[PDB]
Structure 1
Amino acid sequence: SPVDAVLFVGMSLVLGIASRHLLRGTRVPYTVALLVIGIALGSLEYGAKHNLGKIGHGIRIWNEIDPELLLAVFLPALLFESSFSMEVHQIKRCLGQMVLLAVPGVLISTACLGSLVKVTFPYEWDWKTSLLLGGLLSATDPVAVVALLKELGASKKLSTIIEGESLMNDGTAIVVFQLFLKMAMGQNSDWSSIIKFLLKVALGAVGIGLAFGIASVIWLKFIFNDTVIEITLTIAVSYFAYYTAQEWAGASGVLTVMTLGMFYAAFARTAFKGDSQKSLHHFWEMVAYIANTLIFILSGVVIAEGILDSDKIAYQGNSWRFLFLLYVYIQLSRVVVVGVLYPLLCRFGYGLDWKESIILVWSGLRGAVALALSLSVKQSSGNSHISKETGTLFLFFTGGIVFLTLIVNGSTTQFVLRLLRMDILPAPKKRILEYTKYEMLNKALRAFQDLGDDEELGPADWPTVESYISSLDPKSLKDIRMRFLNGVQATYWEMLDEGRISEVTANILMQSVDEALDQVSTTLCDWRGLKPHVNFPNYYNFLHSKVVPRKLVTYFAVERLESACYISAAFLRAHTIARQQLYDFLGESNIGSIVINESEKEGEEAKKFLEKVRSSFPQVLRVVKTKQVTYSVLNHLLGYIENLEKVGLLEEKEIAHLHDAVQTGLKKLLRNPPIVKLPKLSDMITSHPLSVALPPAFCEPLKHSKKEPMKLRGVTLYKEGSKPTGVWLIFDGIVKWKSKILSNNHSLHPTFSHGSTLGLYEVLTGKPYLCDLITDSMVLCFFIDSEKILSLQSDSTIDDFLWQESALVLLKLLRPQIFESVAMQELRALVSTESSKLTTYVTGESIEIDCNSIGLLLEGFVKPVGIKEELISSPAALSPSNGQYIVETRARAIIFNIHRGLMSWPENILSLSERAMQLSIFGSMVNV
């Protein structure tokens, strides 16, 4: 007999596999087909008394399945992954509406449904059992709703809203179902009894789940490099959570497993390995899928057994009337609960409209959970409390509700989508889709360009490759804003590809910009999407209560402000790059200036947040940047190691050691944020690039003490035209430069970065201060007198290096049209190149600027050739006027050699030789 049960399980599994395979994108889920097949099989086994053999034995051995055993085997398996694959950031974005739809939504739904099925539902029912029915089919199938919504059209709001509300409705409905099913078996008599029972079954289960989750997350953080033990540990901890919950504490094990899934979705994304997460999700999806198909087949067969029993419930000819009435009651209950919650749903979280309201009310899919609970009721029934017809009627009613609710509410929802103007794709997103379907074509064409150079295998055939990929202004403010926001999206994509931010941060930023793209007509609301993720409420940690450890403060501050810090940094860099790109694209359009000013003013509270973080926690910024840098570095190393393992180029021991080392580094990162000692002033002096010219004797004036590096926001450094009293050093912070005399035109983002010396040009030339410096953020800055640098000017090499640094700063100043749109990173390479040479020019000589090169005069006067004689002053930024410049005074100079298509997609894209190219590579005629 045990072999019969496993044979039934395997047969049901094969039927599930077949039904899912045949019914992909057929506007009908495989689950309803499984239910119908199970009903047919049960009818053939019981209704017709046809001896099915061993399959019949399996049917009759699973017909007597214990209720509690059914819950234990199935319900946690259904609910673990449904609560595991959550995008917890989106949930925390709209958690208020989630709980509002979950707890009081289910309460109201159960109350209304029980009242309706008690007043007019003639079977001489009881109020407790009717409310039990309400709480039974007040549960929404999460996986079916997720699949429907992915097939359905919902940008990001309805998807997560309905997903989470169904997920939490499962738990709330199972809790209320347990409460109502436990009617008067020696307990649950008075109001205090049910209150304490709820307290236990809910809070104790949640606490057990959270404790087990914490223990397992610590274990995972302590597990360095192994995929399999992670899935196995998840299985073991889930089983022990269920065991402790229901056989040690008496709580609800299913709710404990569901809370465990919540905790793993929330605080265990970084605990799991980078490559093990996909496999773990696939395996738990597989467990949930087997559980779902098996519970559906079992429900179908038990319904068929029940409705065609000796009493012949189905052949009464009247039960279907009340089944249709119950479906109407489901619809009415959903309508009334959505209407009641609408006055509060709209004011919290995501804005909900009547369109979203009707999509929400119509997208109620009672599936596996309701069927499992109904099977639980139609088992161990027939006693004094729950009778026998009073049992099947529940099972047949719930099965018919699942049938109708998955056929009509699963099919006609798309037809409703066709109305109400939601299936239409907005132009801001249509541009994105058509661009991404245009990069597919270009990437494929470049690949076919590359795979045509070889000659041993002969030409390729373009038509088949094309067949296999056959699935392929300036005066308008809104278009300019949309182009700017698309540029911001491209910048986020590029910075994620290069590795500024992890996957979750990029997802948050892209979701926010997608939300902001819908309000392109009005002011840019990009930062409004990021507002929930950037919070700096209080700093009670600095009230001396916890600064005594002076190390846990850094840990807590990082763990709380870490994601917000990446979000703000990426936001600022994206808007800077996008502003520069838009300025290049438009040049001098007034609309361009308006939108740039709009973006600059809009991205101000993020700067305020970063300034507050810097002023409160000076060391959190360095730790956060270190964590980001090492995370990106380790991801690159992991990619290289995966490539090597694919090749097999190294032995399976050295490559295993390297992979283990990289995984250990990643786990030590995601476990504890990097510990960086607070740098002293001398450490920053040594780390500063200018310290090479600074002798070690000058490196220890009591290790450069007696001065505090910090400078508050807005503190001036030196006024324009003032005497060069000294030169500053910028170890960390922001300095803004302004000057009317200098050609500050097209200087969109005037800013010097860390590791720079400022004012060196004036102190080594004696000229008045060219630029006015204002510190936009708190800057860790140091001052060194003019006399020290003038003394350092004694030797030739030090003087040459000092004038090289002066030249770099003077390129940053004089020519922001080209060199402002680049960090101080590459300019050091340009100045350090041996081709770039410092030269001294005598009167009568000239400057040999030519093609593919640029020049810079530092001191002296130059006479141009071919133009009216001009006395070009010391800061010149000499450039080839044609694609000359004789010297007239004592002069010394220096010479140098000199995804981003989404902003302008349709505005950034024949000769007899081109056609020859096209034929020699492609087929007859296909544009490249």
Structure 2
Amino acid sequence: EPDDAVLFVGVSLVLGIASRHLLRGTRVPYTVALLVLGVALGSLEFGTKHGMGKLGAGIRIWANINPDLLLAVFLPALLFESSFSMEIHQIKKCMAQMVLLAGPGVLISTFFLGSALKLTFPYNWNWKTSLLLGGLLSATDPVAVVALLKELGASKKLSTIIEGESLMNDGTAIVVYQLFYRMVLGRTFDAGSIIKFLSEVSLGAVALGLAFGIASVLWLGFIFNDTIIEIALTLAVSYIAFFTAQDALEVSGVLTVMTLGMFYAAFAKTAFKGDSQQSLHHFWEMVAYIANTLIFILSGVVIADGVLENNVHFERHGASWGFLLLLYVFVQISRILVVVILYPLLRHFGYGLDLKEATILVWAGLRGAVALSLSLSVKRASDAVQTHLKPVDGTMFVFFTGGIVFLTLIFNGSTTQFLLHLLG
């Protein structure tokens, strides 16, 4: 029973090197193909009652993964790679634009989308739950989009903005979700309580980043003439900061591992010199790639589970499927809404954002596994004793987040190719 999982990890990574050997340089990028293959395996095991004898058991184990673990195992090997592969040149001039786009943006979007669904969805949802789903659907991780913006070699400003916006969006999205979750549970909040919660959980978590950064930079300076330990040290530090933030200090872990990666991007030269700097990057690249292959295939599996696990109960009558496209058009309308509201500030701050770059920011709102963890968090709570939340409500969120994950990458991610190559 335990080994079936090691089988699935191996099979999923082999599917990764197939879909990268093929589908490279073609018009169909990596991530969309990964997610489709994941949905394929998930459908083959769950839907087909014949089942698969060995792989199927491991697929089922990985599909029942706990969401907190789903974040803890993977994100510290994704956010760190992103925050480390960026450069100081652009970050110090784009920081104004991304922080202005990833805290106010998510507040606006959450407000809008939450209101929208509660008004036009007959499932008898309430304001807190609807704003809860808004906070869920407010994260962004356009991996395919940054991949293209480096493949076709566009301006680096757009790429830096669109990465950091995704990072600080994942962070503040988890923060707003946690707030609305405490709200749904029954905890009452006043203005001071909320302005203390957000302030601490954002800015206090940010400090842990550089605390660990300076400590581990000194300890990288003490070590002489070595590369293997220095790299394993950085890896262990990234993996320990996430736990020190999410479970020890009751603060956000994404901003912690994000402030730790850019601090390393700032002080890489003092700690690593010669070939040691070059190897540091290659190793981290693999950890990224592996972590990228497994996250997308697993994601697909999960979402397939979420459609078929209770297929008799829901995801059969077509009315739910129409509401799913309604929520989709609601998602981009709010993205458009956020960028229209924030256009003047984004204009004067940093380097000027022209209309076309604003057009790419309207696109590239691809959803990521970070919100899959949150949807699965709500469903796990709903199955257990819950107040206001009921199992069918968790049932709903799992398909709605999963559907927007599939729809955004297949449509927004694939057609991003057309806008940059021909229209621009």
When normalised by structure 2's length, the TM-score is 0.91
Show the counterpart of 1:221. 221
Partner of 1:271: 271
Taking structure 1 as reference, are residues 184 and 355 closer, same or farther at Cα in structure 2, changes over 3 Å only? closer
Q: Distance in 2 between matches of 1:161 and 1:242?
A: 24
Q: How many residues align?
A: 421
Question: Is the contact between residue 42 and residue 304 of structure 1 (CA under 8 Å) also seen in structure 2?
Answer: yes
For residues 358-416 of structure 1, what are the alpha-carbon distances to aligned partners after superposition, in whole Å with 9 as ceiling and x for unaligned? 12212322233333433333434323243333224322222222222222222322322
Matched, 1:417 2:420: yes
Give the match for residue 34 of structure 2: 34
The 1:262–1:122 alpha-carbon spacing in structure 2 relative to 1, beyond 3 Å, is: farther
Match of 1:350 in 2: 351
Take 1:223 and 1:142, find their aligned partners in 2: how far apart are those partners? 37
- Provide the C-alpha distance between the structure 2 equivalents of 1:277 and 1:391, rounded to a whole number of angstroms: 46
Provide, for residues 668-717 of structure 1, a one-character-per-residue CA deviation record: whole Å limited to 9, x for no partner.
xxxxxxxxxxxxxxxxxxxxxxxxxxxxxxxxxxxxxxxxxxxxxxxxxx
Partner Cα separation in structure 2 for residue 41 and residue 417 of structure 1:
32
Q: Give matches, 1:245-394, under 5 Å.
A: 245-310=245-310, 311-383=312-384, 384-385=386-387, 386-394=389-397
1:171 to partner: Cα distance:
1.8
Deviation at 1:188, TM superposition (A): 5.5
Aligned CA distance change for structure 1 residues 76 and 353 (closer, same or farther; 3 Å): same
Contact 2:171 2:253 in 1 (8 A): no
Note the alpha carbon deviations across 1:449-499, whole angstroms, 9 max, x for none.
xxxxxxxxxxxxxxxxxxxxxxxxxxxxxxxxxxxxxxxxxxxxxxxxxxx
Aligned equivalent of 2:114 = 114
User: Contact 1:91–1:160 at 8 Å: present in 2 too?
Assistant: yes
Q: Is the 8 A contact 2:72 2:243 kept in 1?
A: no
Distance 2:309 2:204 in 1: 41
Larger Rg: 1
Q: Which amino acid aligns with 2:75?
A: L
Measured against aligned partners, the alpha-carbon deviations of 1:413-457 in whole angstroms (never above 9, x if no partner) come to: 23223454x3xxxxxxxxxxxxxxxxxxxxxxxxxxxxxxxxxxx
User: Quick one: distance in 2 between partners of 1:363 and 1:239?
Assistant: 28
Shift of residue 22, structure 1, vs aligned partner: 1.4
CA contact (8 A) 1:145 1:163 kept: no
Which residue number in structure 2 is paired with residue 591 of structure 1?
Answer: none
Closer, same or farther: CA 253–346 of 1 in aligned 2, 3 Å = closer
Provide the residue aligned with 2:127 in structure 1. 127
SS at match of 1:138: coil
Displacement of 1:275: 1.9
Structure having the higher helix fraction is 2
Counterparts of 2:228 and 2:345, CA distance in 1: 45
Matched, 1:401 2:404: yes
Query: Counterparts of 1:316 and 1:308 in 2: how far apart (Å)?
Result: 13
Deviations 1:829-852 (A, max 9, x none): xxxxxxxxxxxxxxxxxxxxxxxx
> Which consecutive residues of structure 2, in runs of 5 or more, have no partner in the other structure?
none
The answer to which structure, 1 or 2, has the higher relative contact order (CA under 8 A, 6+ apart) is: 2
- What is the CA-CA distance between 1:15 and the residue it aligns to? 1.4
State the TM-score, normalizing by the size of structure 1: 0.43
For 2:188 and 2:266, how far apart are their aligned partners in 1? 34
Q: What is the Cα deviation at residue 161 of structure 1?
A: 2.2
1:281 and 1:389 mapped to 2: Cα distance? Answer: 46
Q: Is the 8 A contact 1:225 1:273 kept in 2?
A: no
Aligned equivalent of 2:78? 78
Do the aligned partners of 2:106 and 2:169 also contact (CA within 8 Å) in 1? yes
- The alpha carbon displacement at 1:25 in A equals 2.2
Matched with 1:178 is 178
Mapped to 1, the partners of 2:142 and 2:264 lie a distance apart of: 17
Cα root mean square deviation, aligned: 2.2
CA–CA distance in structure 2, aligned partners of residues 413 and 63 of structure 1: 30
**Aligned residue number for residue 794 of structure 1:** none
Change (3 A) 1:313 1:303: farther
SS of aligned partner of 1:94: helix
Q: Distance in 1 between matches of 2:99 and 2:141?
A: 17
Q: Deviations over 1:700-737 (max 9, x none)?
A: xxxxxxxxxxxxxxxxxxxxxxxxxxxxxxxxxxxxxx
C-alpha displacement of 1:339 = 0.7
Q: How does 1:916-927 map to 2 (within 5 A)?
A: none
Q: CA deviation at 1:340?
A: 0.7
CA deviation after TM superposition for structure 1 residue 212, in Å: 0.8
Aligned to 2:24: 24
The answer to whether the 8 Å contact 1:77/1:288 transfers is: yes
Change (3 A) 1:2 1:315: same
Counterparts of 1:157 and 1:208 in 2: how far apart (Å)?
27
In structure 1, distance between residues paired with 2:290 and 2:55: 19
Partner of 1:625: none
Residue-by-residue CA offset, 1:584-635 (whole Å, 9 max, x unaligned)? xxxxxxxxxxxxxxxxxxxxxxxxxxxxxxxxxxxxxxxxxxxxxxxxxxxx
SS of structure 2 residue aligned to 1:286:
helix
Structure 1 residues without counterparts, runs of 5 or longer = 423-928
User: In structure 2, how many angstroms separate the alpha carbons of the residues matched to 1:88 and 1:104?
Assistant: 24
Secondary structure class of the residue paired with 1:343:
helix
- Partner in structure 2 of residue 196 of structure 1: 196
2:42–2:305 contact (8 Å) kept in structure 1:
yes
Residues 436-835 of structure 1 correspond to what in structure 2 (within 5 A)? none
Alpha-carbon contact 1:148-1:410 (below 8 Å) kept: no
Question: Residues 125, 291 of structure 1: CA spacing in aligned structure 2 closer, same or farther, 3 A cutoff?
Answer: farther
The 2-side partners of 1:408 and 1:142 are apart by 12
- Report the Cα offset of residue 141 of structure 1: 1.0
Tell me which protein shows more strand as a share of its residues: 1
CA contact (8 A) 1:371 1:399 kept: yes
Distance change (3 Å), C-alpha of 1:55 and 1:283: same
Whole-angstrom distance in 2 between the partners of 1:343 and 1:290? 40
Change (3 A) 1:84 1:188: farther
Partner of 2:241: 241
1:153-209 CA-partner distances (Å, limit 9, x unpaired): 632332222222223222222222232233344645333333332233222222222
For residue 7 of structure 1, give the secondary structure of its aligned residue in structure 2: helix
Question: 2:102 corresponds to which residue?
Answer: 102
How far apart, in 1, do the equivalents of 2:416 and 2:63 lie? Answer: 35
For 1:155 and 1:203, the matched residues in 2 are separated by: 31
Aligned mates of 1:184, 1:410 — CA distance in 2: 33
CA distance in 2 between partners of 1:142 and 1:412 (Å): 13
Structure 2 CA distance, aligned partners of 1:37 and 1:328? 25
